[PDB]
Amino acid sequence: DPKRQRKKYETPSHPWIKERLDRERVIMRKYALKNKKELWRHETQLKEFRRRARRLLAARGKQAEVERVQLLQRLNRLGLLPADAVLDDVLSLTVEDVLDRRLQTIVYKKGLARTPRQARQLIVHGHIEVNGQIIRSPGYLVLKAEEDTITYSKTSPFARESHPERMVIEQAKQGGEA
Amino acid sequence: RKGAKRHLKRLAAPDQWYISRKRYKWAVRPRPGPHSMKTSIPLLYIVRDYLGYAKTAREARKILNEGRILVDGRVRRDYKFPVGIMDVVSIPETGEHYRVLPNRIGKLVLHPISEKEANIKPLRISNKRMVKGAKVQLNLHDGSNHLVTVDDKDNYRTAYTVLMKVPDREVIEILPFDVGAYVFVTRGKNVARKGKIVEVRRFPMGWPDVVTIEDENGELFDTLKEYAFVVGKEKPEISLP
Amino acid sequence: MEIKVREMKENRLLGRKEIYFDVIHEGEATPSRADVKGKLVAMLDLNPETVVIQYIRSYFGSRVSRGYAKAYESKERMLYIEPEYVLVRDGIIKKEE
Amino acid sequence: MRVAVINYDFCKPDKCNLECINFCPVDRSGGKAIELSEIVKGKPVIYEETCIGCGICVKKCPYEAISIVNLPDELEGEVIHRYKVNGFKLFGLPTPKNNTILGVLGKNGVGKTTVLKILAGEIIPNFGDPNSKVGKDEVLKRFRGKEIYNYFKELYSNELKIVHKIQYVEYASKFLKGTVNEILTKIDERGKKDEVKELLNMTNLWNKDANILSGGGLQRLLVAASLLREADVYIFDAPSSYLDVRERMNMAKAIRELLKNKYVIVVDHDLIVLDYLTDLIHIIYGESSVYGRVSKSYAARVGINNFLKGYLPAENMKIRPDEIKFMLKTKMKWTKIIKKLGDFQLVVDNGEAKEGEIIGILGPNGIGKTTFARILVGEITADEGSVTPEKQILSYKPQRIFPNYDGTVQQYLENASKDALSTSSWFFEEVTKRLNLHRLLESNVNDLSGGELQKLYIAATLAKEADLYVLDAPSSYLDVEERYIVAKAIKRVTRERKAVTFIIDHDLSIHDYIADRIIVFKGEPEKAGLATSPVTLKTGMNEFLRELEVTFRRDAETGRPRVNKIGSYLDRVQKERGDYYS
RNA sequence: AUUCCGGUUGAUCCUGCCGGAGGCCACUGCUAUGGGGGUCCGACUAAGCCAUGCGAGUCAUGGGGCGCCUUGCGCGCACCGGCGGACGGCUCAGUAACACGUCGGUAACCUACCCUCGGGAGGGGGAUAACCCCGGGAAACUGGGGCUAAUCCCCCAUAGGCCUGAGGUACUGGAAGGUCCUCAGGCCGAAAGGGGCUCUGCCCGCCCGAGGAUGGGCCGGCGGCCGAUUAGGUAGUUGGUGGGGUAACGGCCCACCAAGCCGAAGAUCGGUACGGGCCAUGAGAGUGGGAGCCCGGAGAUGGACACUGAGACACGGGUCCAGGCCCUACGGGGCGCAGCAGGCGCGAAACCUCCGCAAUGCGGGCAACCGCGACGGGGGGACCCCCAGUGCCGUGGCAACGCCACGGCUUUUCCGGAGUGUAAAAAGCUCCGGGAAUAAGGGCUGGGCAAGGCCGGUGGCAGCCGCCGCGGUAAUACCGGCGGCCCGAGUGGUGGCCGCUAUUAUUGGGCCUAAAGCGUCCGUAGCCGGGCCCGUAAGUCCCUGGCGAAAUCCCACGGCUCAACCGUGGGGCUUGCU
């Protein structure tokens, strides 16, 4: 009767709702996602945050206070909330905020990639460093403290400013919503 | 089925060992010895995991057979030997001594100490037989046994503690179980907690007696008398935590 | 190659210095045990007859390998304590047939 | 192809309601796969040509009388080697077993020599296409996952110093000079020449030269060469050919005393020496000239009895419809020839050979019989004595068999005769069919099995209509059913032509089966060959066996002969009674 | 996401069932690039049968020998002797039971190895392997004679052990048929002062006693399926007296006394089933499952019985029956894979007859070390899970969501190589070189249900259709092309469980007409019960002590690039019991 590793993403209750399909199609094009699986993964992350917040609203002390503090400091660390935040703000959060904390998206920002799809390729081909560490997982959620340490790899041609694609990417220095 | 157990699976191991339960399949099954399985850990784990003088059991066994680790002043060459609560693990080549004591989490740890205290071992008396020759055998919680005479048989009582000079086994400083006695808990919920005794309740039949204990910060908590280990009259005098 | 030591702890029971170190190999492959050993004896004037390298492990996306080496006070302790496969790897021993 | 079989001991057609036929899909769909019969006691019979397996009958029969068996097929496997796009294929190889001695029993034409060459590195498998000219690499890559992978890895990395005694002793004879002593001292690397001599009884021939050697003397030499050579793997392809009973016993003893921590593989057709000499024996089954599959290990006595019964009870294969049987049953005179070839005096003590009766020739390995046949064919002329009537149409077949002709079998038999292949002939429908050469007509001869070749030479020799046939070592390289078939062929042709035949061999089964008289050679091997008048069968057998002090016991219900251990109760009884070979 | 949608009519509202839509498990079609992690892989049918090999050995510091080193030192070999082989490993047949879980008990018991303490090791004697001579027997196996030792065996005494009787009351305990002291009568009755060194001391050892520990045995309270178309069951059965037996209490067994015990709150019987921790599902309540990891139990073809040992009624030991198979010289002998691999067979339904003791551990050993199909390492496999790939950038064009061309880039993956990695290897990791090459399907396309007023073929045929329903010459519903939608290295089909289902309803359903109020009354158990006062404090609530293993679950923090995974800590879980 043992453990049996379970999925960390939830699929929708109905597969063919026009509203959900349209919404997800838009998100997937905006954020350049390969998989509904990937999207639903981040949705499930959010859902678990929300459920914890709910429980801790409807909870009592000495524990469920610890977990309140832990939830809030985790979300601060991830960059989803400010330090002065609350469970009300958890419930205000969105999957878009999560996807904005992906690495692919921050690299489309930080003017490093010119396109989320090219950001994906840079990550996967090994041209992005986070705190000196090569990361190749574009779904990696960046911490708000690691965000300012994102850079091309030292062993990357894109780190040579003479590189053609680097020159194009910096011909278009842009950021903001991603 | 047909007989005794010669093995132990690392998941089925004691909860008080600091063992890394999922890394391998097997654990050292302790030999019968001084203490119990609930209040002990094997010397291999002490030499290899706790102190880190070996990454491997072959190295540890070489060490133990060379004779570099004492347990209460005696060389112990077996890697399955039980090392228990309030035991002194000495390494002279390094000049280190450790007291095996429990943690607040309930697990066994090594508290560093020096030579003076390292020549001391407190022993809860835990029983008292009358043996042939009309002599008194004190039956102590490390499974040890001390013979005394019908003269001080009354100075010696069951829940008391005896400080013992261990490479020689000479009693010094009987510490009685009374009110005001400084105490160190060894098991339960209030594990690595200490204070002065306040009260004792008796509970008619085989229900164990209970002691009410006052900590340093004035708090006041109960536990079992058998789990209440006396370390001093008014001060622990054995450098506990 | 650049060696940068992290920890150097003695073990009088077995008789060996245990060295944990970083090998920075920016731009190059992870170095060979021979070259690491040479640089290590230089960085620390050790007896290469007794120095034995346990591991050099390179990680994902780092070009900073992590190594564990051992420096015995006596070759006899080395041959007694240390296993034959490690000795063969460092080349102290030609496998005995 | 799985079909059903009935036990007929558990079958009770009365107390059954005939659930088998009733719950058969084929009978229900109209066909016939199970049906009653008066060929048996009103009991059912199963027609394999229609049964599809499926076991309904098995689990409907209340008295669990029906079982499913397996019939072999040229369909399913991972073919290891194909010689030719339509010639022959092989499924599986046996693994050579670090320290044990492995036997490989099989039949004629099924893949023994082929297995051995694959394991010896002589040839590469070429799993599918005979073409594709790829060896060593892709073979290893394809055998990945197995233990034979390790074997071949070492073999192709030449980490083992394999030897190989080959099936064609004359093709080996051609490639060595000197005499035995310097041959052996030159080839030795283990220092056991004395032991080898004492075992294989090579004292007399210790100074004779290789070219003038008898068949079995030469065999002993090659076997000794192989033994003395140091290696990790030791392959012996039919090391019992041209030998006599005692010498092949000694040979087995030598092999299993001197090779005791080596991989050893042994192909041999002699069940006696395989019972001895083998720890395990793989069986090779299939259809001769078509396909061969290897079996499981099958310890010697079990493997033998299984090979004899058909069935192998680990693959659940019925490899033969029926069992081996072990059946039971003047025109020229001369003077007492004396002959002398440098040494080896020979005296024969004349006979009569009435009509077409068969004359066997028995004796040790090293006295006459081949000199004698050579004299009769006239290759050698006697120091004294001669045959009468001389100058008679003659044929011959020596023991110098090896592949020499470059044409095909149809040409061979053509230039031999017309009766060899004219289906007009009783000769054809008796010999060439029962020998199954119609399945080898379009096969070149230099690529044949030892037994197919032997059958061919015998066919030619008996197709050449004559008055004096002479066949030496005809049973060599042959299995047991073929031994008996060949014997029946000889007897048939000889009694049809009313001629003489002089069969030399070391197979008392053959001599007992056909020989209506025999001739025994006595004397010191290689020094003196003293034959005698033709003697009746049992007497000559008993004398030939009283010499060499060997004894045989035949099972009654089958007839399988087996040698009795020296000193055994039955040896002593059969000796003190004089009933050698009962 | 605490959800709905389609279907009874000419239309409507209901009831109600079917279906869709979700997840998981197993088989399965088509398809398939990579890596990592993990408690996955002959469990479902056959606890059916098994070819081969391996899975338990170790000690030369117990003993005498045989051999090799020219001998010394030393090396090897078996044999006797010890220790172990009763663990581990596999399977789930049987079992509805103190088997399991949990709380407790044993003052009613055993325990080799281990620890502590306290003591002791005295005096004799003997045999027999190995070896030597001869063998027998097909084998399996086995005989006779000679010779020899021991940490082998026997004896004697001293200690000690057990019983009984008397009395003293020193010990512990909650409580003495216990321990202890003295005395009586008895029975049983040890030991290796052995071996090795740096030898006058040390090490490893032998026996007894007291305790402990370890591992078990036994007892009890509570707790957990179905059936009344199973209602009476039990005869040593319930109890007692006295015994025997057992390690130990016990109708466990016996002799003699009595008539009890269980049961409608369901006994007995039958059916099914290893139990649990856990798992799946679901908003939860709940429903369901209980192969894989741990704990316990049981079993080793079925059945029955014993020896030896601390421990077995003994998976790799013994005996018999039944049943089957193998070898045989027909006299006899041997085997039962539910160990790892591998096969047969069964089936819809599951891998290699690999490598290594390097880790973890076990046993042996003074130790070094040796062995271990445990374990580890690999490989095979659309087992689960995590991370990714099948290109990206510009310009220009298009039937512009995307494609095509022209130029540029990168190289995760592919190819090759070097180092590290590894027990060795492989993978992985770092680096070099080459090059957009080397890499996308499956289903659907009338509505449920996202997506075609397109085309060609067939023409109530063929076919589809989960349900509704389409199809009889203009078919968006079959087949095909083009297109499009969903998911995507996966996607579909079949079966099963949960959900849907407030179609089992405690939460939370209904019973005039839809399924459903006994024909009516009376009453036993059961359940529900007016108001005040007093008490108790059983339920109930609070607080506190001891327990309810670990893993699993939640959370944070750390380490493998992140993750999965692992560790640290906090919490929860176990129905709870006390």
Ligand SMILES: Nc1ncnc2c1ncn2[C@@H]1O[C@H](COP(=O)(O)OP(=O)(O)NP(=O)(O)O)[C@@H](O)[C@H]1O
């Ligand atoms: N080089 C070859 N080329 C083509 N066919 C061959 C070759 N060698 C053998 N064959 C055929 O393959 C079949 C079996 O091969 P082979 O291994 O030689 O038989 P075998 O087992 O040795 N029988 P035998 O020697 O008679 O005991 C024979 O019938 C040959 O005709």
Ligand SMILES: Nc1ncnc2c1ncn2[C@@H]1O[C@H](COP(=O)(O)OP(=O)(O)NP(=O)(O)O)[C@@H](O)[C@H]1O
């Ligand atoms: N040319 C020759 N010169 C001298 N001696 C010869 C010659 N040929 C044969 N011999 C010897 O004659 C003796 C018998 O010869 P041969 O008849 O060929 O052997 P065999 O008895 O048939 N044994 P086998 O063929 O193995 O069954 C052997 O010792 C030969 O060495």
Ligand code: SF4
């Ligand atoms: S096999 Fe069975 S069904 Fe057929 S005849 Fe025999 S008993 Fe009847």
Ligand code: SF4
């Ligand atoms: S197996 Fe089936 S088809 Fe063949 S004979 Fe038996 S019942 Fe007929």
Ligand SMILES: [Mg+2]
């Ligand atoms: Mg051949």
Ligand SMILES: [Mg+2]
């Ligand atoms: Mg000859």
Ligand SMILES: [Mg+2]
């Ligand atoms: Mg509707």
Ligand SMILES: [Mg+2]
């Ligand atoms: Mg099975």
Ligand SMILES: [Mg+2]
């Ligand atoms: Mg299983």
Ligand SMILES: [Mg+2]
């Ligand atoms: Mg005595």
Ligand SMILES: [Mg+2]
């Ligand atoms: Mg069952």
Ligand SMILES: [Mg+2]
């Ligand atoms: Mg079986």
Ligand SMILES: [Mg+2]
């Ligand atoms: Mg499967």
Ligand SMILES: [Mg+2]
């Ligand atoms: Mg449709």
Ligand SMILES: [Mg+2]
């Ligand atoms: Mg219903």
Ligand SMILES: [Mg+2]
């Ligand atoms: Mg209703």
